[PDB]
Design a protein around this nucleic acid. Structure first.
Ligand code: ZN
Ligand code: ZN
Ligand code: ZN
Lengths: 323, 65, 98, 108, 124, 144, 81
RNA sequence: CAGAUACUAACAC
RNA sequence: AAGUGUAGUAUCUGUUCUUAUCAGUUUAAUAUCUG
C-alpha cells in the first residue's frame, strides 16, 4: 500500500471518468474548519494578552506571538475537538497515481458533506458536474438538523478544478446522490427526488414520499432505482418517463440496517448492514415493475423481494463491489 | 421470569423499551465493529464511546411514567 | 342462554346508519361494510373504506375523513405546483407559469 | 502518540501501541522521563488545573509501524494506473490520520 | 379514561389499522403503532371467537390427501421395487409446491376462500 | 438429510395443520420442530415460513400436549427461520387488549428473547419518542 | 423440576434404564454435548447417581444434538429433583 | 356436573 | 384372552336460568358474581 494523507474522515469518493481523478468528500463531527481554527486561535491570543494589566503584558504578548506561530501537526497531536454538533468538511480532487491535491474546497463551519456524485446532465451534454450533499448544523444524538444543501460545481480543466456553480437548499440531509438518465436522483431524508440542473438551483422534476425512514443510499439500472432505507432495507422504485412518476413496486420482508449496496444483476442486490451481515435479495420471477383502497402487503409494497443469501461476516461492511 | 429481559402481560411500553436500550448498549459494547462505527461517526475515542454508553445504561429512556 | 351468548342484551347505535340499532357485537361489526352504512357514506360524500369501520358518529366520520383527505394529498405528488421550472435567467416558476 | 486501544511495555524497553484506528507502532523507550512533574500534594485552587506543553517525541523513538487499514470507509477496485490489474482504492483512517491508500496485489 | 374509537382514529397515522377493541388496551397508541409496522403479522382472527380453532370445520366431506405429482408418477399409489425411479422421483423430479409468503396466516375459511441472473450455476 | 425431503412432506404437514383433530395438529407441530432443527443452515426457509403460517394459528390452543408441541415447533423455527421472523409474528399480540393474547405472546417472546437476545437488537421495530420519554435508538441511525 | 444451578466440573451420569436418553427431552437420538452438574448434585451420597432418576449411574449423560443447537445445555444443572 | 366412548405422553409397571 | 396404573385432552349423552332501570365487582367485549 501506498498512503495519501487526508485532513478529515473520508466519507465517500467517486472517480471522474475522463481523467481518473478522485473527488473525495471528507467530514468530521466534533471538528473545526481551518477558518474557524484560525479565528479561535486569534481570539485565544487576544484574550491571553488582555489577561495581563502590568508590564507582564510584554511577556503575555511574547507568549501570544509564540502561540500564534506554534503549529503542532494534527496527525501527531490530534485535531482539536470542537463541541457537539460542530462539523468540518472538505471536497478534495486528488490524482490517484501520486496523491497530489489538484483542488481543495473547504465548506463552511457546521456544514458536513454526506454524499457526492459526478455526472453529465442531458440539458448541457458535455460538461461534468460534481454535486455534493451537505447537512447544516446536524446534531447526532438526539437527531436534529437545520436542513441541508446540494452544492453544484462544474469540474473543469480536464477534471482538475471545481468551479462553484450554485448552492441549492433542501429540508433534510441529502444523504444519497445518484446520476440517473441524464438528471440526478437525490435522497433528501425520507424523500426521493429527481433533480434537473437549471441555472440558479437544481430543479425538482419528480418526487416520491413513501420511503419509510431516512434514505441511506441509491443505486440504479435502466428505469429501476434501488433505495437503501436506514432500517427498512431495500425498496425497488421504477421511474416512469411519460407519467413523470416514481412508483414503489417491491420491498424486503426484513428490517436491515443497510450500510452499503451492490447491484449484482437487473433483479438482484447485495446488501451489507451495521450488524456485520451480508445478504443477497432478489426479485422473484414475474415481478411486475410496470405499475385509500390500496393497502399493499404487511404495511409494505404489494410484491416482495426474496432473501437468497444471508451471512454474518463478523465485521461491519461499508463497501461491496462486483469485480 | 428469572431471566432479566423477559416480559409478561403487564409489561409497559417504558419497561420494554428500557430493555431494548440496555440490551442495545450491551450489544454495542461487545460488537467491536459496531463500536468502531459509532466512534468514527461521532469523531470520538472508543474509550469515551464506551463510557458514554455505560452512562446511558442508568436511565436510557428518561424517567418511568 | 343463546340470547346472552350472542350478546343480544347489548344494543349499539350508528348515526351514519340513520340511528339503526343492530343489537349485536357481530351484527354491528359486519354492518360497516354493508348497504345502510354505505348509503350514509354516500349521503355524507365519504368513501366506505376500512378507515371508517367502527366509526358511528357523523361529526367524527366527517372530521376523520377531512384528516385522511389532507394526509393523502400531502402524501401524493402534485407536478402542477411541485415541479420546478426556470422562466429565464434562473427565475424559478411553477408548471402552470411555465 | 496516536490514541491507543492498548499500550504494552515490553521488558526489553519497547512500548507497543495498538492504535484505536490506523497503523500500530513499536517505540523504543529511550528514556524513562526540565518537564514539570504534577502531584496530588500540590495546592490547587477551585476549578483550576495543572497545565503542560505538548511537544515532539522525547522519551520514545519510533522503530516499527504496522500498516493497518482500519477503518475502511469507502473502497473502489479500478485500474486507474493503466497496469492491466486493478488497484483497490481505499479511503481509510479517521480524523487527521485519514488517508487514501492504493492497494496492489504483490510484494513491495 | 380510555380514548373513544373515534378519538384514537384521529390520533394515529393509520386509522384503518384501528379496531374496536384497541381502545381497551393498556397502551392503545403503542398497539396501533406496532400493528402499522412493516412486515409485522396480525394476531390470529379467532382469538375472540367462542368456538375453538378449526372446530367449526365439520359436516363437509373432503377427498383424501393429493400426492405430489413426482410421487404420484412413481406409481406407488397403484402398488398399494423400481428403486432407481424411486430415487429419481426425489432427486430429479421433485418440484417445489406453492409455498405461502411470510405473514399470510391460515384460518377456517382460508382453504375454501442484460437480464441474465448473476452467479448462476453452469448447466450439467 | 431432511433438506432432500422437506418439500415432499410440506403439503402433508400443511394438510395435518389444517385438520380439525388436535392430535394431527399436535403431531404435525412435532414434525415441524424436528425438521426445522435438522435443516438449520441449509436454505429451506421458504418451506418453514409457509409451515409457520399453519402452526402459528395454534398458539391459542389450551390442550397441554398440543400447546407444548406448538411451543416446541416455534423454538425449532426460531433457529431455522431466525429470531427476526419469530419477533415479527409476536409484535402485534404483545400489547393486544386481551390478556389471553398477551399471556401467550409474552411466553413466545420470552422464549425468543432467552434464545436470541443479541440477534433481536437488529430486529426491534422503531418506537417513536414520547413527550417525556426518548425511545429512538439514535446511534443505529448514524450514517458513515 | 430441574436444579438449574450453575453447572460445575462434575459430569452427569445415567443408570442402565435411562441410558441413551437426553436429560432434557428423552430423545434416544444423537447424544452430543456431555452433561455437567452442580457440585451439590455430585456431593457425598449423590456421587455417580443418575441425572434423570437418581439410580446407580453407569454411563455419561448427554444433551442431544437438538438440545445443543437450541443452547438448552446452557440452562444449568439438569438433575431432576 | 355425572356417565359412556375415543385419544395423547418412544408415560410407567 | 397382550393386562393394569399415573398425568392430561377430545367427543355424543342427560342439565345449560326473560330483567325492571341503574350502580359495583369483573372482562378485550359480553357473560358471571353482589346491591
Ligand atoms: Zn352505520
Ligand atoms: Zn435412571
Ligand atoms: Zn434433547
Amino acid at each position: 500500500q501506498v498512503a495519501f494523507p487526508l485532513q478529515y474522515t473520508p466519507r465517500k469518493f467517486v472517480i471522474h471518468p475522463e481523467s481518473n481523478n478522485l473527488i473525495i468528500i471528507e467530514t468530521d463531527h466534533n471538528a473545526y474548519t481551518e477558518a474557524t481554527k484560525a479565528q479561535r486561535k486569534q481570539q485565544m491570543a487576544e484574550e491571553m494578552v488582555e489577561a495581563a494589566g502590568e508590564d507582564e503584558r510584554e511577556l503575555a504578548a511574547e507568549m501570544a506571538a509564540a502561540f500564534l506561530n506554534e503549529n503542532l501537526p494534527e496527525s501527531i497531536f490530534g485535531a482539536p475537538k470542537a463541541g457537539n454538533g460542530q462539523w468540518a468538511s472538505v471536497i478534495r480532487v486528488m490524482n490517484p497515481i501520486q496523491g497530489n491535491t489538484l483542488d481543495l474546497v473547504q465548506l463552511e463551519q457546521n456544514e458536513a458533506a454526506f454524499s457526492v456524485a459526478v455526472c453529465r446532465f442531458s440539458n448541457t451534454g458535455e460538461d461534468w458536474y460534481v454535486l455534493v450533499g451537505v447537512a447544516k448544523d446536524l446534531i447526532l444524538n438526539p437527531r436534529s438538523v437545520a436542513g441541508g444543501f446540494v452544492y453544484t460545481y462544474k469540474l473543469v480543466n480536464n477534471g482538475e478544478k471545481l468551479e462553484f456553480l450554485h448552492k441549492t437548499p433542501v429540508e433534510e440531509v441529502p444523504a444519497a446522490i445518484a446520476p440517473f438518465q441524464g438528471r440526478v436522483l437525490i435522497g433528501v431524508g425520507k424523500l426521493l427526488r429527481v433533480y434537473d440542473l437549471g441555472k440558479k438551483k437544481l430543479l425538482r422534476k419528480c418526487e416520491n414520499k413513501h420511503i419509510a425512514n431516512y434514505i441511506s443510499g441509491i443505486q440504479t439500472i435502466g428505469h429501476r432505482v434501488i433505495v437503501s432505507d436506514v432500517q427498512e432495507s431495500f425498496i425497488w422504485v421504477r421511474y416512469k418517463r411519460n407519467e413523470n412518476q416514481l412508483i414503489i413496486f417491491a420491498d424486503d420482508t426484513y428490517p436491515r440496517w443497510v450500510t452499503t449496496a451492490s447491484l449484482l444483476d437487473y433483479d438482484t442486490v447485495a446488501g451489507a448492514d451495521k450488524f456485520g451481515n451480508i445478504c443477497v435479495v432478489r426479485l422473484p420471477p414475474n415481478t411486475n415493475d410496470e405499475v385509500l383502497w390500496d393497502r399493499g402487503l404487511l404495511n409494505g409494497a404489494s410484491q416482495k423481494a426474496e432473501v437468497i443469501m444471508n451471512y454474518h461476516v463478523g465485521e461491519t461492511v461499508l463497501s461491496l463491489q462486483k469485480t | 421470569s428469572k431471566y432479566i429481559g423477559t416480559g409478561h402481560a403487564d409489561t409497559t411500553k417504558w419497561e420494554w423499551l428500557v430493555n431494548q436500550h440496555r440490551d442495545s448498549y450491551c450489544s454495542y459494547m461487545g460488537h467491536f465493529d459496531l463500536l468502531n462505527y459509532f466512534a468514527i461517526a461521532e469523531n470520538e475515542s472508543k474509550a469515551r464511546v464506551r463510557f458514554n454508553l455505560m452512562e446511558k445504561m442508568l436511565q436510557p429512556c428518561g424517567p418511568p411514567a | 342462554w343463546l340470547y346472552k351468548l350472542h350478546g343480544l342484551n347489548i344494543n349499539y347505535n350508528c348515526e351514519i346508519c340513520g340511528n339503526y340499532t343492530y343489537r349485536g357485537p357481530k351484527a354491528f361489526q359486519r354492518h360497516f361494510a354493508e348497504w345502510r352504512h354505505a348509503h350514509g357514506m354516500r349521503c355524507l360524500g365519504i368513501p366506505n373504506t376500512a378507515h371508517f369501520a367502527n366509526v358511528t358518529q357523523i361529526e367524527d366520520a366527517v372530521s376523520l375523513w377531512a384528516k385522511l383527505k389532507l394526509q393523502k394529498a400531502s402524501e401524493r405528488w402534485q407536478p402542477d405546483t411541485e415541479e420546478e421550472y426556470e422562466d429565464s435567467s434562473g427565475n424559478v416558476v411553477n408548471k402552470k407559469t411555465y | 502518540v496516536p490514541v491507543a486501544a492498548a499500550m504494552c511495555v515490553l521488558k526489553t524497553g519497547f512500548l507497543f501501541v495498538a492504535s484505536e484506528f490506523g497503523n500500530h507502532y513499536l517505540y523504543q523507550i529511550a528514556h524513562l522521563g526540565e518537564e514539570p512533574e504534577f502531584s496530588s500534594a500540590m495546592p490547587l485552587e477551585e476549578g483550576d488545573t495543572f497545565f503542560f506543553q505538548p511537544r515532539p517525541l522525547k522519551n520514545l523513538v519510533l522503530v516499527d509501524e504496522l500498516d493497518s487499514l482500519s477503518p475502511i470507509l469507502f473502497c473502489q477496485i479500478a485500474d486507474l494506473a493503466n497496469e492491466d490489474t486493478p488497484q483497490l482504492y481505499v479511503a481509510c483512517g479517521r480524523g487527521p490520520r485519514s488517508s487514501l491508500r492504493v492497494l496492489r496485489h504483490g510484494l513491495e | 379514561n380510555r380514548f373513544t374509537v373515534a378519538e384514537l382514529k384521529q390520533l394515529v397515522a393509520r386509522p384503518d389499522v384501528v379496531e374496536m377493541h384497541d381502545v381497551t388496551a393498556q397502551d392503545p397508541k403503542l398497539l396501533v403503532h406496532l400493528k402499522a409496522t412493516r412486515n409485522s403479522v396480525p394476531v390470529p382472527r379467532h382469538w375472540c371467537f367462542k368456538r375453538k380453532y378449526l372446530q367449526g370445520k365439520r359436516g363437509i366431506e373432503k377427498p383424501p390427501f393429493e400426492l405430489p405429482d413426482f410421487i404420484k408418477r412413481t406409481g406407488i399409489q397403484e402398488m398399494r421395487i423400481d428403486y432407481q425411479k424411486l430415487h429419481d422421483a426425489f432427486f430429479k423430479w421433485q418440484t417445489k409446491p406453492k409455498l405461502t409468503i411470510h405473514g399470510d396466516l391460515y384460518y377456517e375459511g382460508k382453504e375454501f376462500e442484460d437480464r441474465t441472473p448473476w452467479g448462476e450455476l453452469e448447466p450439467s | 438429510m431432511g433438506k432432500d425431503y422437506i418439500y415432499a412432506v410440506t403439503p402433508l404437514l400443511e394438510d395435518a395443520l389444517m385438520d380439525r383433530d388436535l392430535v394431527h395438529r399436535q403431531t404435525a407441530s412435532a414434525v415441524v420442530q424436528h425438521m426445522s432443527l435438522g435443516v438449520y443452515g441449509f436454505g429451506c426457509e421458504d418451506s418453514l415460513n409457509h409451515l409457520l403460517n399453519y402452526v402459528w394459528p395454534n398458539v391459542f390452543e389450551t390442550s397441554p400436549h398440543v400447546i407444548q408441541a406448538v411451543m416446541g415447533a416455534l423454538e425449532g423455527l426460531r433457529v431455522a427461520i431466525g429470531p427476526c421472523r419469530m419477533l415479527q409474528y409476536c409484535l402485534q399480540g404483545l400489547f393486544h387488549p386481551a390478556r389471553k393474547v398477551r399471556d401467550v405472546y409474552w411466553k413466545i417472546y420470552n422464549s425468543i428473547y432467552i434464545g436470541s437476545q443479541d440477534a433481536l437488537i437488529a430486529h426491534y421495530p422503531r418506537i417513536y419518542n414520547d413527550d417525556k420519554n426518548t425511545y429512538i435508538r439514535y446511534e443505529l441511525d448514524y450514517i458513515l | 423440576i430441574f436444579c438449574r444451578k450453575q453447572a460445575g466440573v462434575a459430569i452427569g451420569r445415567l443408570c442402565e434404564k435411562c441410558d441413551g436418553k437426553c436429560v432434557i427431552c428423552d430423545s434416544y437420538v444423537r447424544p452430543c454435548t456431555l452433561v455437567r452438574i452442580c457440585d451439590e448434585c455430585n456431593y457425598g451420597s449423590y456421587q455417580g447417581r443418575c441425572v434423570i432418576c437418581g439410580g446407580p449411574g453407569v454411563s455419561d449423560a448427554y444433551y442431544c444434538k437438538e438440545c445443543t443447537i437450541q443452547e438448552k445445555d446452557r440452562d444449568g444443572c439438569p438433575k431432576i429433583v
